[PDB]
Amino acid sequence: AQNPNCNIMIFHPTKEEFNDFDKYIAYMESQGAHRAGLAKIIPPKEWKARETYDNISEILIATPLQQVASGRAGVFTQYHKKKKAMTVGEYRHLANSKKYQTPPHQNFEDLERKYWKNRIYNSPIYGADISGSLFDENTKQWNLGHLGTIQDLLEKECGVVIEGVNTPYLYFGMWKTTFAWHTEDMDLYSINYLHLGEPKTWYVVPPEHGQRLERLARELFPGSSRGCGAFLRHKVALISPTVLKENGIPFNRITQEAGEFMVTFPYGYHAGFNHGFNCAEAINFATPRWIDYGKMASQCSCGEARVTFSMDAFVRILQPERYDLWKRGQD
Ligand SMILES: O=C(O)CNC(=O)C(=O)O
Ligand SMILES: [Mg+2]
Ligand code: NI
Ligand SMILES: [Zn+2]
């Protein structure tokens, strides 16, 4: 078996290997990359996502979210408080202000220490989940707005045509902005490109060990667990690497820099934080190997997780027994 310790693998495709997305994901998995739950892909030196980022300041962040933490430094939840709309220009200026900017630090490790020590005492503002794309329409390779759709993948594998569309989302981050522990909707893959700015640190649990994370989460967030059998779908819980080590949960960590792709694999729990002002783009995708994960994915039916239009059909076709109860949570 390839990659039996489930280490995060880093790939360096040639421009020739960068032509066929599906085939390169399949290549990564042949080398065991999926076992880690996350892989990094450094694009060929000839590749660019677009010419410059000089003209992005007028993008609107309609609902910036202030991420308010509760709990202890290592074990906390966050809620999202809606703020007034601002432009990317305005957000960048905010991220760089004395109140929000990245503190002096030595290296990524010092910064990680400071994150876990101090995150809960601040409430950074995240421009998340903005529909759109920063890829130039003439970028032909690994353009996240031109990937094959999950609906077409399900049709090709299962023979059923379904409604729904699949488009990318932009994330504008600042120091301490945080993504809680989660897998993707319907345990899909995701791909994330860091277009610009400061790095993003990621933590991931191997898919074969996801249930161990879930069990620890039920113990650490006992009221949440009683409220919903899949409460990590709410995307609110944070557990530090120190806490995971103390409880023997296998995980890995890696820092993504501007110009690099990250791929998360089905049922790979991940969490992380931004180092400073940045902009990432991400999208979910499927392969034939996803189908069996989709059929087994947990679902939130307490009503909190509230998800896209397109998830209906996935639940309807792949999880017909769950469909009724899940849709009652959606309505
Ligand atoms: O970039 C972020 O804030 C979070 N991204 C992801 O969880 C992802 O791409 O799967
Ligand atoms: Mg603009
Ligand atoms: Ni994710
Ligand atoms: Zn729920």
CATH assignment of the domain containing 120:
2.60.120.650
List the beta bridge partners of residue 125: 66
Q: Which residues does a 6 A CB cutoff place in the pocket of ligand 1?
A: 171, 179, 190, 192, 264, 270, 280, 282
| Residues 77, 69 contacting (CB under 8 angstroms) | yes
Q: Which domain holds residue 17?
A: 1-331
- Number of domain units in the chain: 1
Long-range contacts of 111-115 (CB under 8 A, 24+ apart): 111/275, 112/201, 115/176, 115/201, 115/273
Q: Which of 190, 193, 269, 278 to mutate to test the pocket of ligand 1 (most atoms within 8 A of CB)?
A: 190
Report which ligand 1 atom has the smallest distance to the Cα of 173: 3
Report which ligand 1 atom has the smallest distance to the Cα of 182: 7
Closest CA to 308 of 77, 134, 151, 152: 151
Closest CA to 264 of 42, 40, 38: 38
- Is 234 among the annotated ligand-binding positions? yes
For ligand 1, atom 9: residue with the closest CA: 192
CA of 264 to the centre of ligand 1 (A): 9
Report which ligand 1 atom has the smallest distance to the Cα of 178: 3
Ligand at minimal distance from the CA of 269 is 3
For ligand 1, atom 10: residue with the closest CA: 190
| Residues 22, 287 contacting (CB under 8 angstroms) | yes
- Is 302 among the annotated ligand-binding positions? yes
Ligand at minimal distance from the CA of 279 is 1
Report which ligand 1 atom has the smallest distance to the Cα of 270: 7
Query: How far apart (Å, rounded) are the C-alpha atoms in residues 75 and 33?
Result: 29
| Residues 173, 126 contacting (CB under 8 angstroms) | yes
Query: How far apart (Å, rounded) are the C-alpha atoms in residues 151 and 286?
Result: 9
- Is 192 among the annotated ligand-binding positions? yes
Query: How far apart (Å, rounded) are the C-alpha atoms in residues 47 and 126?
Result: 28
- Is 184 among the annotated ligand-binding positions? yes
Query: How far apart (Å, rounded) are the C-alpha atoms in residues 249 and 209?
Result: 8
Q: Which residues contact 302 (CB under 8 A, 6 or more apart)?
A: 227, 228, 231, 329
Query: How far apart (Å, rounded) are the C-alpha atoms in residues 305 and 299?
Result: 9
Report which ligand 1 atom has the smallest distance to the Cα of 179: 3
CA of 282 to the centre of ligand 3 (A): 9
- Is 126 among the annotated ligand-binding positions? yes
**Residue 201: in which H helix or E strand, if any?**
strand 200-204
In 16-74, where do the E strands start and end? 38-41, 60-61, 65-72
The runs of H, that is alpha helices, within the chain are 21-30, 88-95, 108-118, 150-158, 210-220, 222-227, 241-246, 290-296, 311-318, 320-330
Report which ligand 1 atom has the smallest distance to the Cα of 126: 3
Query: How far apart (Å, rounded) are the C-alpha atoms in residues 59 and 130?
Result: 10
| Residues 149, 189 contacting (CB under 8 angstroms) | no
Resolution attained, angstroms: 1.8
- Is 158 among the annotated ligand-binding positions? no
Burial of 106 (0-12, 13-18, 19+ CB in 10 A): exposed
Q: Which of 40, 41, 175, 179 to mutate to test the pocket of ligand 1 (most atoms within 8 A of CB)?
A: 179
CA of 214 to the centre of ligand 1 (A): 19
What method was applied to determine this entry?
Answer: X-ray
CB burial string 158-177: b at 16+ within 10 A, e below: eeeebeeebebbbbbbbbbb
CA of 329 to the centre of ligand 4 (A): 8
